[PDB]
């Protein structure tokens, strides 16, 4: 539902 760049960048960098 309109995924933001912020939460994407977060997901990509998450552990």
């Amino acid at each position: 539902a309109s995924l933001s760049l912020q939460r994407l960048l977060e997901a990509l960098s998450a552990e």
């Epitope: 539902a1 309109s2 933001s4 760049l5 912020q6 939460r7 960048l9 977060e10 990509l12 960098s13 998450a14 552990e15």
Partner: antibody, heavy 121, light 112 residues
């Protein structure tokens, strides 16, 4: 309307579990974009991001202490809970909870007045 | 992990004059139209208060004597003109990637 208030032990036994609660009103943690996070500040030292939970229950933790962190939300009661296992002296700090108002950027727009946590024999 | 270095650590400025605070990031915190830098003012005995989001967005209710600039690795907050209530510590914060980190902070002494 927008208030967050931290509640916590005050003093803790080294190796015992630090348990913090963040009650809030003025907004709902089921509103799209909304999130709540924990930042801690030792005495005279800087700021450190611990963890946060988004409106859709996606959780994030500081890798440095990810071993020890557990976060959750009671959307019904408008509360967020943080637990930090094997509590130690260096976990002595002011623990803040703050709101992340949108999906679009992770900044913290409203903070609680803090909750001074000491851990000592 | 992105390390934010604030410059200067301490700054003494007279009323009506200009305080400038650098924040340098060990990696670019800017990509694809976004600069993921944020500024807070922490007064003694209070939590930090948000002044600027995404480098140059003046947070509602905050006066325009707080300006944010910078892009990539090098960011700048100007308090201009400085006032009595700016006797605080100022932090930058990035949300470029996890872990999210703050600078060590910059304390502004008001000269009188």
């Amino acid at each position: 309307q927008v208030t967050l208030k931290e509640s916590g032990p005050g003093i803790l036994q080294p190796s015992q579990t630090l348990s913090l609660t963040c009650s809030f009103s003025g907004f709902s943690l089921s509103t799209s974009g909304m999130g709540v996070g924990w930042i801690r500040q030792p005495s005279g030292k800087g700021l450190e991001w611990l963890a946060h939970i988004w409106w859709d229950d996606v959780k994030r933790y500081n890798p440095a202490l990810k071993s020890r962190l557990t976060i959750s939300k009671d959307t019904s009661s408008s509360q967020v809970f943080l637990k930090i296992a094997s509590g130690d002296t260096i976990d002595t700090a002011t623990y803040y909870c703050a709101r992340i108002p949108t999906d679009d950027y992770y900044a913290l727009d409203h903070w609680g007045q803090g909750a001074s946590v000491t851990v000592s024999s | 992990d992105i390390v934010l270095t604030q410059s200067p650590a301490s700054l003494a400025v007279s009323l009506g004059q200009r305080a400038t605070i650098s924040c340098r990031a060990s990696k670019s915190v800017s990509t694809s139209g976004y600069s993921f830098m944020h500024w807070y003012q922490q007064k003694p005995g209070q939590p930090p208060k948000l002044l600027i989001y995404l480098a140059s967005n003046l947070e509602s209710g905050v006066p325009a004597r707080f300006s944010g600039s910078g892009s990539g690795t090098d960011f700048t907050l100007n308090i201009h003109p400085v006032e009595e209530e700016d006797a605080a510590t100022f932090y930058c914060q990035h949300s470029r990637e996890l872990p999210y980190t703050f600078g060590g902070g910059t304390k502004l002494e008001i000269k009188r």
